[PDB]
């Protein structure tokens, strides 16, 4: 078993930067002489991995002249020679010289980028959930940078709640910001006895926290 | 074009067995050694096992040995992975792969199929994620998908059959009690909508729903 190093499990780098990763061995791979069987992988979000070196620094067929990978012995470097937005994702290297074949630990690749404000938007339970015991409210925060963001929610002001649930999207492959939502969940009744809704976004783009909101009756 | 789409996935007890299946596409199967590839929730990638195209030679990890047994069917270019006394640590995203006749191990990945080992299965309930707030919007209108309270992954979540790619924003599945939801959401030029009308298809591998959703003004 050769057990696969890669360096650093975490890699926050600017666009038009220049980009190593290492990746290193438990001992010397080669196989049959014949090179060393020294891959790499890049999977990017909500897809399969797919190879982009191959035999230590073949560019897989399709491959960008930015990919290059290099190494011998222990030592395997690739260096991404010119960022590109759509290269944010998972790197892994791996050994097939020497069974079991190993993967690496994951290099993770993210994108530092100038700050972007969020757009927020509320939405209110349908109908249709409504029938299904509970009713869900959410709010959507959408492109914004940094990740980190804040949501509060105040029902008509009085209080805020514990029932919410908060979740990201993935750094966008061209867009290079974040998204995410929160979901404030309550009973059809508990929430057929309230007025109005709030979310309060405070992100460190705006000093002014982001209010969005709906009174859930006219008559 | 090769292609590589997986087949079985979904909940296995503990203990159980799971046969998935790799139905290739493209290329002369019985000419390349196949492959079974995991990654596992930590996004953790292993390879699982591989076979020689007469499926006399094969190999396995320690960790698969003796559990898993790899097939191959040449007349129905079609790889297999029976799975036994399985534990949770293989709960994964099984990929079947393909190598590379110059000297590569996984250059064609098939889609993936996820097995999951341990307790019941449950479809989501899809409604309709709607404006409400008449804020001074214009240009931008955001509709959405809720996937309400579904056992075990995936789901996967189109937009007018794959048409709608760029305004796409899909979170992250949040476990809520012991059940997962979701919320896929596009954002269309105020032009379109409510004009132009925008679906979102909806499917639950692990129950075999799928359904598409229409979303209309409120
Ligand atoms: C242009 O289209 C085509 O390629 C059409 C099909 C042509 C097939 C020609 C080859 C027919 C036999 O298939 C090859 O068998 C080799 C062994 O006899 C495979 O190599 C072995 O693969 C094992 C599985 O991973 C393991 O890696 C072994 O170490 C490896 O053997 C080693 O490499 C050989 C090439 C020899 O040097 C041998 O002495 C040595 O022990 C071929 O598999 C490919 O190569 C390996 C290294 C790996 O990269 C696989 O993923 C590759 O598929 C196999 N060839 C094919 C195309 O399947």
């Known amino acids: 078993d050769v057990l696969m190093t890669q360096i650093p499990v975490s890699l926050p780098v600017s666009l038009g930067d220049q980009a190593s990763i290492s990746c290193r061995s438990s001992?010397?791979?080669?196989?049959?002489?014949?090179?060393?069987?020294l891959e790499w992988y890049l999977q990017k979000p909500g897809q399969s991995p797919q190879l982009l070196i191959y035999?230590?620094?073949n560019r897989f067929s399709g491959v960008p002249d930015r990919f290059s990978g290099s190494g011998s012995g222990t030592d395997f470097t690739l260096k991404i020679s010119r960022v590109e937005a759509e290269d944010l994702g998972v790197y892994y290297c791996?050994?097939?010289?020497?069974?079991?074949?190993?993967f690496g630990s994951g290099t993770k690749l993210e994108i530092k980028r100038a700050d972007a404000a969020p757009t927020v938007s509320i939405f209110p339970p349908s109908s249709e959930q409504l029938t299904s015991g509970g009713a869900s409210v959410v709010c959507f925060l959408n492109n914004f940078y940094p990740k980190d963001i804040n949501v509060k929610w105040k029902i008509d002001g009085s209080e805020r709640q514990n029932g919410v649930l908060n979740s990201w999207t993935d750094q966008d492959s061209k867009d290079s910001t974040y998204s995410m939502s929160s979901t404030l969940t309550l009973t059809k009744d508990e929430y057929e006895r309230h007025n109005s809704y709030t979310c309060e976004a405070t992100h460190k783009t705006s000093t002014s926290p982001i209010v969005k909101s709906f009174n859930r009756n006219e008559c | 074009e090769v292609n590589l789409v997986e087949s079985g996935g979904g909940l296995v007890q503990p203990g159980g067995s799971l046969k998935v299946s790799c139905v290739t596409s493209?290329?002369?199967?019985?000419?390349?050694?196949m492959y079974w590839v995991r990654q596992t929730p930590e996004k953790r990638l292993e390879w699982v096992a591989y076979?020689?195209?007469?499926?006399?030679?094969?190999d396995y990890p320690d960790t698969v040995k003796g559990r898993f047994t790899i097939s191959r069917d040449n007349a129905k270019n079609s790889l297999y992975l029976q799975m036994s006394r399985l534990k949770s640590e293989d709960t994964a995203m099984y990929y079947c792969?393909?190598?590379?006749?110059?000297?590569?191990?996984?250059?064609?990945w098939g889609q993936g199929t996820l097995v999951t080992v341990s307790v019941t299965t449950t479809a989501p309930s899809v409604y309709p994620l709607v404006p409400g707030c008449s804020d001074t919007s214009g240009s931008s209108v955001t509709l959405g998908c809720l996937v309400k309270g579904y056992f075990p992954e995936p789901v996967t979540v189109k937009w007018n059959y794959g048409a709608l790619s760029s305004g796409v924003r899909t979170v992250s599945s949040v476990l809520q009690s012991g059940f997962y939801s979701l919320s896929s959401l596009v954002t269309v030029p105020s032009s379109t909508w409510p004009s132009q009308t925008v679906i979102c298809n909806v499917a639950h591998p692990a129950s075999k729903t799928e359904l598409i959703k229409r979303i209309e003004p409120r």
């Open positions: 792969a393909r190598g590379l006749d110059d000297g590569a191990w996984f250059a064609y």
């Open positions: 493209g290329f002369t199967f019985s000419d390349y050694y």
């Open positions: 076979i020689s195209q007469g499926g006399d030679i094969t």
């Open positions: 001992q010397i791979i080669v196989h049959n002489n014949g090179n060393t069987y």
């Open positions: 035999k230590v620094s």
């Open positions: 791996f050994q097939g010289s020497h069974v079991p074949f190993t």
